[PDB]
């Protein structure tokens, strides 16, 4: 009918929980926002929207730990005029004193998913725009393995391999189980000055069905 | 973790469990001052106890304390000498004077007891210096802070402070809840997480590199205030050595809970001398400089660690020489 | 502003001998190892640091090749600025800082959401087969503090890897370069940097390290022409026939490359 | 102290016979070895000590030729001298603010300690004075062929401390290597030298120390050890003209065709040197 099925897999992933951000700890499964992010990496234009419907989990859950050195603060805005009119060096000194910060992390070690989604028309879209055209472009790109940029599993240093499906969903580890996860992030409202939203997540038969993030009652 | 919130909510329903009521916490106190109803000080009660090794203060249930940065925040009714006596060993007297002024000012927000203590404040051994003290009326049972009127005033102050912004609580998922701008601290050191700073926290956003979407401070992650208080108090309670639900392994301190704990407590020998309610949540965390990190997290039953120990022992199997030997030697014996 | 016209991918191989390629902050200073396979592991930020350092050492502050993030290798010399509505400032600083132009950055003040992403990306590196580190004990003739004077001596420890071979992957995105001005001369400099990273990195802990091979795939289209993960399969590495027991030199392996599809070209800088 | 202006690399060979080249603090006192293959090892830290000793012996405390890691010294006291000389107060675990730049004390130390100037040091202790990286580096040495250490048992006819249980005997044991041959690598960089003033006369002294190192190190445990070969590659410009691993490949060691069975003297091996690229010159007579 409409909508697409896409498969993705990799060796590392990290979907940090909002409340344990400084010491990264990952969710048990990819939240809808990451799925939103990945799809836009293949094809997206201002005239359309992505709508996520389902996710399939095909592997067991595993964890591992890693620690790294990091930086404490961002860089400030310069003034080009004065900067050149008197030669002055600009830089950030990583090794100096408190600038160095060490952060631990815990992350998943083997993943695989299937995503179900469909398009929708943005208000600013031109009259000539049709969802089917963009969908066909998307299918072409996916088959050819072409993309605007390499997808990632939450962090740029975690590349993701992907494929397009033309068949039925294979069985999965927890196909015969029901498991609870509690509340988790749904999406961010940019209109309401970047305000987040939440929903209750329950995994059963390795499939998840979040409510529609555009629905006004969800915004409440 | 919402598990801690649920555990607190459940166990606080038991009157004798020892859960501090809302808005109160257990602290260290050393002395108590006795003054007559007329506002004149006479009599000092020292509640410190000799623990064999040293003379150390005693645990008392009192209104919660503020997280004092460099700024001056006055505690409600119990404080150290600097705020109360306007004296200290820090040399900078004006700081002490400002602390004393703020302390007296906070009180005013009709009771004869508080009237008397106010009267004494018109003027306000050495061991009292730097310790925590409480007030008692001459020949009066309990303490002034325990009187119902004081509790009403404290509730009024809490209502005053909890106002303004509202949002969705992530732990509960409810809407329009006041959001906490700061979280209460957690005890570290001897009687808390071992090796950490005196006061540590799980959530903190002190540096710009850790912020996003233009948010700041704790507002970077919304949680209702009472919910924040609950799990913090529960975690502090579990850390108490008096309750046998804590154990130290390697670098990480381990805490566990169920409706019963005697068998899991035997994991003490699991390393020291190797051989309706939720069952055996296990949490192990390790300390950073001033903040805490989660090492591992399990909810399995039995408590079995045979995965490594079982392999470790089965690798060591050998038939004995005598018939009176023991199958499971301790690491101490092997090393020796 | 001009930018590269084709998508790119590459693979790099390098080895270490009696050294510690990357220490672990969490376990003393053991070299990192993956508990699942016993294979070695190296993080990318280390490689990025090395590239930054090499460029800084080589160019010596040419007009459009300053480096912003430093680690106390800074030096005092006359700088240059080419001149270039916050977009004005962004372009001005992008036009004369190489690392910003290549990797991107995040800035203290901004409007809503806007990202300086940069077209280059790369992932972790892992060994081809299991490795086993070793422990070493050492001594010293003296002590530091006066308090510990009670005649004077102390110990220490070291960790090393006998031998190991590592592999890395990376990607380059033309459309992103079209938003930052990453051009061809930059790409040539990048190849040179990758080739010559380790020559300036000698220290007391790293021993001897060197790069061995470098394969580059060049796509025909502005976007791709074939799936990436399949291309990485063409490269194959296996132990030579005469080799037996633990590997101890590059001569113990044989590396071969297949034939790529029509739309992509395969090149060998090493 | 004008710095050198080229990149250098070198190779060294040395022998051992009925001795223990470098003992292991953990496994009793067994010589260090690789458990997987049985090849011998020697920590680079061991050699630098010998070079330091040779310099101290030959120069005898001449000005600007002191050594920083001296026998049973207290380092913090030495750091405090720099503050005294430059005449500014120290601070606990901190460096002076740049009003009197810490470069003053840094130069004052680099100027008059040879080993700091050559190898660098870590000096951020309670009395802080910064860090140095050192323009000279070298790696672990390894033997060409596996070695077979063997153990010896001995006796003494005296006792030390009131062994009343006996006035009687006592025994001990020692370990040795029948014979072995070792190889080593090293590097020198110009950019780092320019930060410390490592000059040419220092380089000549360094060559001499390498050549004459072992002749002053006799002891009851080392047996007989000596150096045999030394090859130096010199680049023609400030930055090299070829990868290092290619150069080291030009030197090959193999057993003499006539020798058979275990090796027992340097005559059982053969050494050969290849032809270097255009941009490098090979000098050997050392």
UniProtKB/TrEMBL annotation, chain A:
It comes from the Bacteria. Pfam families: Cas_Cas5d (PF09704). Signal peptide: none annotated. GO terms for molecular function: endonuclease activity; hydrolase activity; RNA binding. It is an enzyme of class 3 (hydrolase). One of its GO terms (biological process) is maintenance of CRISPR repeat elements. Coiled coil: none annotated. Its EC number is 3.1.-.-. InterPro entries: CRISPR-assoc_prot_Cas5, CRISPR-assoc_prot_Cas5_N, CRISPR-assoc_prot_Cas5d. Keywords: Antiviral defense, Endonuclease, Hydrolase, Nuclease, Plasmid, RNA-binding. Belongs to the CRISPR-associated protein Cas5 family. Subtype I-C/Dvulg subfamily. NCBIfam families: cas_Cas5d, CRISPR_cas5. CRISPR (clustered regularly interspaced short palindromic repeat) is an adaptive immune system that provides protection against mobile genetic elements (viruses, transposable elements and conjugative plasmids). CRISPR clusters contain spacers, sequences complementary to antecedent mobile elements, and target invading nucleic acids. CRISPR clusters are transcribed and processed into CRISPR RNA (crRNA). This is pre-crRNA processing endonuclease.
Automatic annotation (TrEMBL), chain B:
Keywords: Plasmid. This is CRISPR-associated protein, CT1133 family. It comes from Nitratidesulfovibrio vulgaris (strain ATCC 29579 / DSM 644 / CCUG 34227 / NCIMB 8303 / VKM B-1760 / Hildenborough). The chain holds residues 3 to 408 of 612 of the full protein.
Automatic annotation (TrEMBL), chain D:
The keyword Zinc-finger does not apply. Keywords: Plasmid. Coiled coil: none annotated. GO terms for biological process: maintenance of CRISPR repeat elements. It comes from the Bacteria. This is CRISPR-associated protein, TM1801 family. It comes from Nitratidesulfovibrio vulgaris (strain ATCC 29579 / DSM 644 / CCUG 34227 / NCIMB 8303 / VKM B-1760 / Hildenborough) (Desulfovibrio vulgaris).
């Amino acid at each position: 009918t409409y909508g697409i099925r896409l498969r993705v897999w990799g060796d590392y992933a990290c979907f940090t929980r909002p409340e344990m951000k400084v010491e990264r700890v990952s969710y048990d499964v990819m939240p809808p926002s990451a799925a939103r992010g990945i799809l836009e990496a293949i094809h997206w234009k201002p005239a359309i929207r992505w709508i996520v419907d389902r996710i399939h989990v095909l592997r067991p859950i595993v964890f591992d730990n890693v620690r790294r050195n990091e930086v404490s603060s961002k860089i400030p805005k310069p003034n080009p005029a004065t900067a050149m009119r008197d030669r002055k060096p600009l830089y950030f000194l990583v090794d100096d004193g408190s600038n160095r910060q060490q952060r631990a992390a815990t992350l998943l070690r083997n993943v695989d998913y299937v995503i179900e989604a469909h398009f929708e028309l943005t208000d600013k879209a031109g009259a000539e725009d049709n969802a089917g055209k963009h969908l066909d472009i998307f299918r072409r790109r996916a088959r050819a393995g072409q993309s605007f940029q390499q997808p990632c599993l939450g962090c740029r240093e975690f590349p993701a391999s992907f494929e397009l499906l033309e068949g039925d969903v294979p069985l999965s580890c927890y196909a015969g189980e029901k498991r609870d996860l509690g509340y988790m992030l749904l999406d961010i409202d940019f209109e309401r000055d970047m305000t987040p939203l939440f929903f209750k997540a329950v995994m059963e038969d390795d499939v998840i069905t979040p409510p529609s993030r555009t629905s006004p009652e969800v915004r409440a | 973790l919402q598990a801690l919130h649920g555990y607190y909510q459940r166990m606080s329903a038991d009157p004798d469990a020892g859960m501090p009521p809302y808005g109160t916490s257990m602290e260290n106190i050393s002395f108590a001052l006795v003054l007559d109803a007329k506002g004149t000080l006479r009599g000092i009660e020292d509640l410190r106890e000799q623990e064999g090794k040293k003379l150390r203060p005693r645990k008392m249930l009192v209104p919660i304390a503020e997280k004092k940065g460099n700024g001056i925040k006055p505690n409600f009714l119990w404080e150290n000498t600097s705020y109360i006596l306007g004296v200290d060993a820090k040399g900078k007297q004006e700081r002490t004077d400002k602390c004393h002024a703020a302390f007296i000012a906070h009180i005013k927000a009709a009771d004869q007891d508080l009237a008397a203590v106010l009267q004494f404040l018109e003027h306000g051994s050495e061991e009292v210096i730097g310790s925590n003290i409480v007030f008692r009326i001459e020949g009066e049972p309990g303490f002034v802070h325990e009187r119902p009127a004081a509790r009403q005033a404290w509730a009024n102050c809490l209502n005053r402070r909890e106002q303004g912004l509202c949002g969705q609580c992530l732990i509960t998922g409810e809407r329009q809840k006041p959001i906490a701008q700061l979280h209460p601290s957690i005890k570290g050191g001897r009687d808390g997480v071992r090796g950490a700073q005196a006061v540590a926290s799980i959530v903190s956003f002190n540096n710009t590199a850790f912020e996003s979407y233009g948010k700041e401070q704790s507002i970077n992650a919304p949680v209702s205030q009472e919910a924040a208080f609950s799990y913090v108090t529960a975690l502090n309670y579990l850390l108490n050595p008096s309750n046998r639900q804590k154990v130290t392994i390697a670098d990480a301190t381990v805490v566990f809970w169920a409706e019963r704990s005697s068998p899991a407590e035997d994991i003490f020998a699991g390393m020291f001398d190797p051989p309706e309610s939720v069952r055996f949540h296990v949490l192990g965390l390790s300390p950073n400089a001033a903040r805490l990190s989660v090492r591992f997290w399990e909810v399995d039953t039995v408590g079995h660690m045979l995965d490594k120990v079982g392999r470790h022992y089965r690798e060591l199997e050998i038939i004995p020489q005598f018939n009176n030997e023991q199958e499971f030697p301790s690491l101490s014996t092997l090393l020796r | 502003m001009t930018a590269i016209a084709n998508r790119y991918e590459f693979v790099l191989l390098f080895d270490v001998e009696n050294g510690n390629p990357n220490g672990d902050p969490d376990a003393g200073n053991m070299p990192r190892i993956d508990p699942e396979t016993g294979h070695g592991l190296v993080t990318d930020v280390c490689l990025k640091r090395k590239i930054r350092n090499h460029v800084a050492l080589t160019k010596e502050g040419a007009e459009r090749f300053n480096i912003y993030i430093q680690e106390k290798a800074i030096l005092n010399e006359t700088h240059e600025r080419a001149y270039t509505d916050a977009k004005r400032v962004t372009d001005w600083m992008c036009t004369n800082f190489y690392d910003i132009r290549t990797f991107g950055a995040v800035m203290t003040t901004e409007v809503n959401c806007g990202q300086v992403r940069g077209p280059v990306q790369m992932a972790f590196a892992r060994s081809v087969e299991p490795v086993v580190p070793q422990e070493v004990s050492i001594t010293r003739m003296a002590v530091t503090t006066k308090a510990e004077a009670e005649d004077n001596r102390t110990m220490g420890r070291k960790h090393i890897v006998p031998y190991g071979l590592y592999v890395a992957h990376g990607f380059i995105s033309a459309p992103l370069a079209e938003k930052t001005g990453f051009s061809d001369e930059d790409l040539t400099l990048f190849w040179d940097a990758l080739v010559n990273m380790f020559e300036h990195d000698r220290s007391a802990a790293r021993g001897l390290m060197s790069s061995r091979k470098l394969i580059v795939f060049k796509h025909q289209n502005r976007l791709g022409n074939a799936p990436a993960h399949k291309l990485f399969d063409l490269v194959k590495v296996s132990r030579a026939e005469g080799s037996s027991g633990p590997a101890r030199s590059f001569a113990d392996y044989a590396v071969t490359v297949g034939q790529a599809p029509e739309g992509v070209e395969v090149k060998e800088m090493l």
